[PDB]
Amino acid sequence: EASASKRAIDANQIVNRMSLDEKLGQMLMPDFRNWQKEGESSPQALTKMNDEVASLVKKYQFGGIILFAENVKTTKQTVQLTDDYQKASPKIPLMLSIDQEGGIVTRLGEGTNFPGNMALGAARSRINAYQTGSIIGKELSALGINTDFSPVVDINNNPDNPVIGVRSFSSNRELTSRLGLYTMKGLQRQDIASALKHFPGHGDTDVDSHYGLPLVSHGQERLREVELYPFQKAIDAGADMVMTAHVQFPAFDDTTYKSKLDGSDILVPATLSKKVMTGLLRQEMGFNGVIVTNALNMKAIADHFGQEEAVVMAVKAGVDIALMPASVTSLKEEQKFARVIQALKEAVKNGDIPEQQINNSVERIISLKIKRGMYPARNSDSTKEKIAKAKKIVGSKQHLKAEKKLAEKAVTVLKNEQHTLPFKPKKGSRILIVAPYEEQTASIEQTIHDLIKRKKIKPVSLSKMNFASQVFKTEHEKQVKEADYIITGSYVVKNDPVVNDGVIDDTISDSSKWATVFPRAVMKAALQHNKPFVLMSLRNPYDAANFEEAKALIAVYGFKGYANGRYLQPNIPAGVMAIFGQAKPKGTLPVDIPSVTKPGNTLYPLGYGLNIKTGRPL
Ligand SMILES: CC(=O)N[C@@H]1[C@@H](O[C@H](C)C(=O)O)[C@H](O[C@@H]2O[C@H](CO)[C@@H](O)[C@H](O)[C@H]2NC(C)=O)[C@@H](CO)O[C@@H]1O
Numbered sequence: 001e002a003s004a005s006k007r008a009i010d011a012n013q014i015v016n017r018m019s020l021d022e023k024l025g026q027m028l029m030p031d032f033r034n035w036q037k038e039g040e041s042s043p044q045a046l047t048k049m050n051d052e053v054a055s056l057v058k059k060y061q062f063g064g065i066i067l068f069a070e071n072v073k074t075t076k077q078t079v080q081l082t083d084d085y086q087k088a089s090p091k092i093p094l095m096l097s098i099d100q101e102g103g104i105v106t107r108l109g110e111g112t113n114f115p116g117n118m119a120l121g122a123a124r125s126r127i128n129a130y131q132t133g134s135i136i137g138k139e140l141s142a143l144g145i146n147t148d149f150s151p152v153v154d155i156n157n158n159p160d161n162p163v164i165g166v167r168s169f170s171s172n173r174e175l176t177s178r179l180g181l182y183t184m185k186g187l188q189r190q191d192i193a194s195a196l197k198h199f200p201g202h203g204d205t206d207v208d209s210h211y212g213l214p215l216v217s218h219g220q221e222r223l224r225e226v227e228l229y230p231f232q233k234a235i236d237a238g239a240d241m242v243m244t245a246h247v248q249f250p251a252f253d254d255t256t257y258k259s260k261l262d263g264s265d266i267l268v269p270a271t272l273s274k275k276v277m278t279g280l281l282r283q284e285m286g287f288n289g290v291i292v293t294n295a296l297n298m299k300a301i302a303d304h305f306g307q308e309e310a311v312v313m314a315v316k317a318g319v320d321i322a323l324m325p326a327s328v329t330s331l332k333e334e335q336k337f338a339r340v341i342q343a344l345k346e347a348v349k350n351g352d353i354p355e356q357q358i359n360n361s362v363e364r365i366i367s368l369k370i371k372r373g374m375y376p377a378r379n380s381d382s383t384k385e386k387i388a389k390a391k392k393i394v395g396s397k398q399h400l401k402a403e404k405k406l407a408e409k410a411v412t413v414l415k416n417e418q419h420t421l422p423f424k425p426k427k428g429s430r431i432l433i434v435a436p437y438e439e440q441t442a443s444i445e446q447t448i449h450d451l452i453k454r455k456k457i458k459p460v461s462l463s464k465m466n467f468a469s470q471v472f473k474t475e476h477e478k479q480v481k482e483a484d485y486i487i488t489g490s491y492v493v494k495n496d497p498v499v500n501d502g503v504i505d506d507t508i509s510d511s512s513k514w515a516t517v518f519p520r521a522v523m524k525a526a527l528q529h530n531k532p533f534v535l536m537s538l539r540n541p542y543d544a545a546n547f548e549e550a551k552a553l554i555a556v557y558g559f560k561g562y563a564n565g566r567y568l569q570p571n572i573p574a575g576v577m578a579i580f581g582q583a584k585p586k587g588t589l590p591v592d593i594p595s596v597t598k599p600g601n602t603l604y605p606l607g608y609g610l611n612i613k614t615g616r617p618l
Pocket residue numbers: 068069099105149163197198202209210294295297298
């Protein structure tokens with residue numbers, strides 16, 4: 001009430017005293033993922049502050065830094081790094097931001113990973129998203145990280161989407177909106193600034209904006225009804241920030257520019273559109289929080305617009321923060337920042353960007369820093385004290401317990417005929433573990449090893465088969481014939497098996513098609529030899545359509561395995577626990593699964609999921 005009124009006035013008074021260089025500095029958020037010091041031969045992961053990076057923070061007075069996995073490998077190192085970044089910031093504390101989404105996008109080396117957004121979708125309950133946001137937020141807070149670029153509220157209603165997929169809650173706008181809203185609230189309750197992404201909605205692309213500039217051709221009515229819906233709900237409920245999409249939406253803005261690549265005309269990406277960022281987001285939708293660009297180093301921008309140019313265009317469009325405006329990995333490259341600043345200055349001096357617009361943007365940034373307790377600094381503990389506290393919080397047993405429950409709830413049973421599941425092996429049974437990569441067979445193996453040690457199943461022998469880039473051969477059939485039980489993980493991004501007249505082609509010997517051909521070959525051999533067989537879908541669940549013949553089929557919505565003594569995601573263990581009757585899946589599909597054998601039909605509908613014991617829909 002009065003705090004918000006005081007905050008706006010304080011932000012105004014503070015910005016009125018800043019020089020233009022200081023104001024423009026606040027609007028930049030670089031990364032320093034890697035760094036090459038004086039005397040070093042090439043850039044390496046920046047895990048510890050040095051005086052070279054600190055001097056650039058002091059010189060350019062950035063508003064924030066985005067951190068990547070390279071920068072946050074251990075809790076102890078992270079707390080030291082964020083303290084050191086704040087010590088380097090000469091006047092205003094930094095936003096220190098990160099992509100700790102959960103599931104398949106996480107960064108913290110020792111943090112709790114969580115099963116991810118589509119898993120939260122499968123589990124349905126919005127309180128689970130709140131708990132996820134809250135725990136991630138608590139971990140980030142302990143680490144001195146104050147901004148999370150989460151939640152993704154893109155709606156994955158194009159199954160071929162290669163960049164969103166299980167990063168989305170759902171193909172349904174209400175489920176996505178509800179879980180996005182509660183993620184955001186959980187983060188904010190821990191005083192973490194939360195950014196909705198990617199506006200105005202990246203869900204219906206089949207092109208990755210990392211590698212090319214995607215186009216969404218839907219009309220305004222559809223965009224308002226679907227894409228914009230979860231953004232509006234979270235904006236109305238007090239979203240702090242919104243990250244843009246480098247994606248073309250001609251229904252909102254058909255302005256074109258001459259590409260710097262091929263000289264051709266290209267539709268403006270939303271990030272650089274005044275109609276989208278000011279007309280729609282700011283004015284129509286009433287968002288007055290911080291608008292941050294998607295990363296400006298991505299091909300969707302960098303291919304077609306110059307480096308300085310993209311930053312200037314983004315600010316002209318109405319964004320408040322330019323994310324990763326230039327890549328500087330040594331002091332020899334530091335003028336890149338000076339050139340971005342000078343380009344912004346010229347735009348202000350010529351009136352192309354009124355100085356008042358700069359003031360308003362910096363006031364938003366400062367206001368957010370005050371609102372979330374970044375400014376002034378709240379914590380008077382020593383770094384040693386902060387480290388000790390964070391080591392008890394980040395990846396804590398309580399957090400691991402919560403992660404396990406959520407991952408297990410999310411497991412979605414799609415088929416279980418004649419009680420194929422749970423597997424109940426006799427002593428000495430041979431279990432064949434089949435998955436694309438060694439980390440995935442290792443995750444399944446370790447989980448089973450733990451079950452044996454904890455006397456949950458009888459002792460069994462385990463063999464592994466890693467099938468990425470392989471073609472199913474006699475040696476593989478022999479292993480199938482020798483097994484008593486077979487667990488196979490399937491991994492797809494875009495599910496594109498070759499099918500003719502309703503028949504999936506199993507005659508394909510091109511090893512590059514391994515993802516859609518090899519698991520089917522294992523199934524076929526297992527069924528032919530009357531072997532208990534379960535297929536676990538590991539990434540996008542659409543591959544469930546590749547296994548209509550199977551008697552047992554589950555989806556876990558997360559594919560990362562086990563490496564260096566650590567589970568990189570909880571999803572595979574949760575699925576293995578379900579397979580052996582040691583967890584209760586409660587998942588229902590948060591997307592439709594299109595039929596592969598009958599194109600244009602839905603094989604499994606949104607909301608479908610079985611009770612593993614009874615076979616009745618949940
Ligand atoms: C490991 C790593 O550094 N990845 C990043 C990208 O992050 C995404 C989330 C990933 O791991 O797949 C990053 O992608 C974009 O950039 C923003 C900042 O990281 C993200 O917040 C944003 O969500 C993401 N945009 C989309 C559409 O996913 C990318 C940008 O250069 O750099 C690495 O690939």
